[PDB]
Structure formats: structure tokens, C-alpha cells
């Protein structure tokens, strides 16, 4: 998973639309994972 920006409120590069994000970027879709789910992944 391609990460591009955090998911959680507060950490740097925020972004709460995390499927839209990662379909605007160039991605099939995007998931909120890692740690506590703070963590925006991309589906590669």
C-alpha cells in the first residue's frame, strides 16, 4: 500500500478523504490503516 497522507486529525499531511485522494492521485482506491488506523493507504 502506497502511503500519501495521515489519516488521523492533527498529523502532518492530513487528508480525511482517503479513498477520493488516492483515486484523485492516480490509485484504484485508498484505506486508513497502520497504527490506530492513522495511517492513509492506497490500494497500488
Same mark, same amino acid.
Given at each position: 500500500? %502506497?502511503?500519501?497522507?495521515?489519516? /488521523?486529525?492533527? &498529523? /502532518?499531511?492530513?487528508? !480525511?478523504?482517503?479513498?477520493?485522494?488516492? %483515486? *484523485? *492521485? =492516480?490509485? %484504484? =482506491?485508498?484505506?486508513?490503516? !497502520?497504527? &490506530?488506523? /492513522?495511517?492513509?493507504?492506497?490500494?497500488?
Amino acid at each position: 500500500d %502506497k502511503l500519501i497522507g495521515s489519516c /488521523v486529525w492533527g &498529523a /502532518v499531511n492530513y487528508t !480525511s478523504n482517503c479513498n477520493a485522494e488516492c %483515486k *484523485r *492521485r =492516480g490509485y %484504484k =482506491g485508498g484505506h486508513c490503516g !497502520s497504527f &490506530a488506523n /492513522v495511517n492513509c493507504w492506497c490500494e497500488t
